[PDB]
């Protein structure tokens, strides 16, 4: 849907992100730029152009590039909300 | 868009 949930088996993620509140760029959120071929992210259905919305409940819809990078890097069971537009 | 396109692979 316009917004979806992806259950990554956290335990490397095989994905690349671009954007942020200060470095907002085109694929004003933090957007998925690349996804490795065999990476966990690709197996889990995460698509290029998806704007990451939240990481295990922590919203990134308006978060610094590094703030989002740290969110995806410390989810502590993992769930990522995305915006497919 | 703006400039300084930063990308981070996780």
From TrEMBL, chain B:
Subcellular localization: Host cytoplasm; Host nucleus
Entry similarity comment: Belongs to the papillomaviridae E6 protein family.
Function: Plays a major role in the induction and maintenance of cellular transformation.
Protein name in the entry: Protein E6
Organism of provenance: Human papillomavirus 66
Included stretch of the parent chain: 143 to 152 of 152
């Amino acid at each position: 849907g316009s917004v979806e949930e992806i259950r990554l088996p956290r335990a490397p993620l095989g994905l690349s992100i671009v954007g942020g509140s200060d470095h907002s760029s085109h694929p004003p959120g933090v957007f998925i730029s690349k996804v490795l071929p065999r990476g966990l992210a690709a197996r889990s259905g995460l698509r290029v152009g998806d704007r990451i919305l939240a990481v295990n409940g922590q919203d990134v819809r308006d978060a610094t590039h590094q703030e989002a990078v740290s969110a995806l890097l410390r989810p502590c069971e993992l769930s990522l909300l995305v915006r497919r537009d | 868009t703006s400039r300084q396109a930063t990308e981070s692979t996780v």
